[PDB]
Amino acid sequence: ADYQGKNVVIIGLGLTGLSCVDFFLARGVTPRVMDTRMTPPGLDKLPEAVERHTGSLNDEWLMAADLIVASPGIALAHPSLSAAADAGIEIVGDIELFCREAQAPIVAITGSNGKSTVTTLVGEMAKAAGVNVGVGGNIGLPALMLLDDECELYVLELSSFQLETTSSLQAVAATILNVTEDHMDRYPFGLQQYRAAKLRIYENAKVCVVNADDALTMPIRGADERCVSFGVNMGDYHLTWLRVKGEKVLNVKEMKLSGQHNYTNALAALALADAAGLPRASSLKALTTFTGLPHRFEVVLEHNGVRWINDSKATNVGSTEAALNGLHVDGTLHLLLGGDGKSADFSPLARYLNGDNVRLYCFGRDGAQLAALRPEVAEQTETMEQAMRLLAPRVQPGDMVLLSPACASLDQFKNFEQRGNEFARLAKELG
Numbered sequence: 001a002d003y004q005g006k007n008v009v010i011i012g013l014g015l016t017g018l019s020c021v022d023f024f025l026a027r028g029v030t031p032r033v034m035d036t037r038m039t040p041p042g043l044d045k046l047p048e049a050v051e052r053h054t055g056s057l058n059d060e061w062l063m064a065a066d067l068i069v070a071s072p073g074i075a076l077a078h079p080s081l082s083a084a085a086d087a088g089i090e091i092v093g094d095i096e097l098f099c100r101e102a103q104a105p106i107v108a109i110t111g112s113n114g115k116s117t118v119t120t121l122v123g124e125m126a127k128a129a130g131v132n133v134g135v136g137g138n139i140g141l142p143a144l145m146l147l148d149d150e151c152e153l154y155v156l157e158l159s160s161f162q163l164e165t166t167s168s169l170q171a172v173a174a175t176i177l178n179v180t181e182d183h184m185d186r187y188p189f190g191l192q193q194y195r196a197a198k199l200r201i202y203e204n205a206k207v208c209v210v211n212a213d214d215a216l217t218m219p220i221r222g223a224d225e226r227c228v229s230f231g232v233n234m235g236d237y238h239l240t241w242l243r244v245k246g247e248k249v250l251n252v253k254e255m256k257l258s259g260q261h262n263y264t265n266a267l268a269a270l271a272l273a274d275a276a277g278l279p280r281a282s283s284l285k286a287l288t289t290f291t292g293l294p295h296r297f298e299v300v301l302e303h304n305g306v307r308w309i310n311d312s313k314a315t316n317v318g319s320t321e322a323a324l325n326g327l328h329v330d331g332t333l334h335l336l337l338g339g340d341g342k343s344a345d346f347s348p349l350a351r352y353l354n355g356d357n358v359r360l361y362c363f364g365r366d367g368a369q370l371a372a373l374r375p376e377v378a379e380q381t382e383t384m385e386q387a388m389r390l391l392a393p394r395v396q397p398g399d400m401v402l403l404s405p406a407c408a409s410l411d412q413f414k415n416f417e418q419r420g421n422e423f424a425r426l427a428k429e430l431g
């Protein structure tokens with residue numbers, strides 16, 4: 001889509017809002033942004049060129065917009081947004097922007113509780129088949145931070161909020177795991193209004209994975225030829241053995257998790273991966289190794305009042321930004337950055353590195369550019385080990401050593417997992 005020369009206004013300066021701001025700036029469009037909160041988390045992350053209004057909405061800005069991008073945290077029913085809509089001003093959310101740009105199929109997942117687990121599993125099933133997969137959305141990493149012409153499949157966890165502002169989603173496979181009322185303050189007209197939001201996920205979906213045990217997850221107008229279902233004792237995928245299309249496929253003894261819940265999660269996940277075209281071989285393997293939703297970070301050592309945190313999986317700028325958001329650091333943050341990154345996306349990261357309590361240790365191929373984000377507090381070495389031996393004598397009680405590289409590790413390691421193990425070993429010897 002073209003946004004050149006449009007008056008764009010973004011509502012919400014949280015993770016989503018910031019991703020949108022960067023999305024637009026990276027296309028030569030300077031948006032105006034607002035948030036009803038006086039000091040939203042992304043306020044100090046904006047470039048000075050961006051006009052901002054916080055503490056309330058600025059209605060003149062909204063009414064003068066060509067496009068309004070509304071974060072999930074504000075309701076379309078808000079009088080300011082209702083007014084803009086009546087005047088015919090287009091309103092979209094980050095997921096909508098994402099769908100317009102995506103060049104790979106999308107598996108979409110929504111429902112209430114357990115959403116993240118099913119999303120994560122589908123992601124693993126894709127990893128097992130060797131698919132460069134991008135997992136994001138409501139699960140944590142804003143969808144727009146995943147855009148990459150290298151990505152071969154996207155797995156998105158979506159909230160009813162994101163769904164209300166999305167119109168161009170055409171999922172290869174979509175599901176509403178269940179419909180259980182939550183966030184009802186955002187749906188004052190009842191369960192039907194609430195159900196309607198989730199149902200949007202099936203619009204133009206190639207295959208709709210439905211919950212045989214929850215009739216509300218069926219698209220309105222009964223189930224069609226696109227619908228495949230999962231359930232405990234009923235459905236295309238059901239239950240011990242996992243039954244699929246009438247044929248047993250796996251004895252639950254082969255998977256690490258147990259319990260009904262963990263089984264229907266595995267079934268819903270398989271139904272989605274089958275629909276997305278992933279080989280059942282690899283999907284089943286993933287089901288047999290899956291040990292659940294991983295922790296956000298791996299604490300490799302906590303000694304002398306210092307925490308050494310491994311987030312080697314943050315292979316891009318958006319992930320590192322996500323790791324830094326709301327990060328509690330009692331003393332100084334010794335941030336490790338480096339490897340093979342996407343230089344085109346480095347500039348915005350500098351805005352997350354301000355303050356008197358942050359030190360950068362940059363290494364690898366793009367270490368020089370990374371260190372250049374804020375030279376005054378950065379050290380530059382060739383390897384991560386050198387960088388760590390550098391910081392070791394410098395840490396004091398209360399500090400945090402964080403490996404959240406913002407780059408891939410292929411220039412010096414076999415994979416980010418190995419880079420993380422290296423970090424674990426070195427932290428134990430040095431901390």
Ligand SMILES: CC(=O)N[C@H]1[C@@H](OP(=O)(O)OP(=O)(O)OC[C@H]2O[C@@H](n3ccc(=O)[nH]c3=O)[C@H](O)[C@@H]2O)O[C@H](CO)[C@@H](O)[C@@H]1O[C@H](C)C(=O)N[C@@H](C)C(=O)O
Nearest residue numbers: 012014015016035036037071072073137138139140142159
């Ligand atoms: C509220 C919400 O939808 N949160 C999701 C959102 O995070 P983000 O930080 O971008 O949220 P936001 O839209 O800025 O809203 C955050 C908070 O500020 C408030 N808000 C937002 C804009 C504004 O003008 N005024 C205001 O008061 C919202 O009411 C909310 O209290 O985008 C992220 C990336 O997609 C999601 O991971 C994140 O999910 C969290 C984990 C969540 O609680 N989501 C709900 C929906 C859920 O899963 O139950």
